[PDB]
């Protein structure tokens, strides 16, 4: 139940970039409305949103995705990210 | 750098059964040599191995997967589990098919 400190953010991003690099690209494609996503890495996460580095058509744009509900702790972030991954996977397969 | 205590095992297994249920089935399929796995849940994890409950059309079999290298801490476990999931996915991409001739 750790608060979303910058130290926690770097930890979440570090692990998210290696374990769920697939989900990060889906975030950029579905919620970030990015086409032709090659790679996507998480740069930061805070209570109100997350920042993604999206590689596309030989170009590295950084986008920001705002959570509808503000996050309070690490567990809150965990639950939103898992749900967003499911929502993204459903839309991508269709 | 948390040691792999029984309390840590319960936490890892809980999260792995929630966010990684797909990868635990690949563990049963690839490393556990189980064919036609319906569901697979992780029951326990310790430095020398992990215990899986594998359901295969009403089988509910408990198998044990022994790690090549003993785990040292929770970070080591984290790394090992990810590589095993990637490896399991890779072998799955090299698909096998019964072969028949014209
Ligand atoms: C933040 C919070 C968190 C935490 C603490 C964690 C922790 C963890 N984890 Fe995690 N994960 C996560 C969040 C997380 N996580 C996510 C979000 C994901 C995603 C899922 C998907 O992909 O969708 C994962 C995912 C995951 C997976 C899957 C991947 C693949 O692809 O296969 C695995 C195996 C893991 C492991 C793990 C471990 C061992 C641990 C302990 C250290 N993970």
Numbering used by the authors:
A (entry chain B): 2 to 95
B (entry chain A): 2 to 103
Provide excerpts from the study:
Using a phylogenomics-based approach and complementary structural techniques, we identify a family of dimeric hemoproteins comprising a domain of unknown function DUF2470. Together with structure-guided in vitro and in vivo experiments, we further demonstrate the existence of a functional link between heme binding by Dri1 (Domain related to iron 1, formerly ssr1698) and post-translational regulation of succinate dehydrogenase in the cyanobacterium Synechocystis, suggesting an iron-dependent regulatory link between photosynthesis and respiration. Given the ubiquity of proteins containing homologous domains and connections to heme metabolism across eukaryotes and prokaryotes, we propose that DRI (Domain Related to Iron; formerly DUF2470) functions at the molecular level as a heme-dependent regulatory domain. We heterologously expressed and purified the recombinant protein encoded by the Synechocystis gene dri1 (formerly known as ssr1698) and tested the heme-binding ability of this small, soluble protein (96 amino acids, 10 kDa).
His21Ala exhibits a shifted binding interface with a rotated heme ring (~34°) relative to WT Dri1. Calculated Polder OMIT maps with the heme, His residues, and bulk solvent excluded in addition to higher ligand B-factors reflect a loosely bound heme. This coordination distance can explain the increased heme rotation and mobility observed in MD simulations, resulting in a weaker bonding interaction and lower heme-binding ability. The His21Ala structure further suggests that zinc ions could bind via tetragonal ligation by His16, Asp20, Glu76, and His79 residues. However, since the Asp side chain can only have one binding interaction (as opposed to the two nitrogen sites in imidazole), zinc-binding might prevent Asp20 from interacting with the heme iron. Such a hypothesis is in line with the abrogation of heme binding by the addition of excess zinc to His21Ala. We observed that all variants with a single amino acid substitution retained heme binding to some extent.
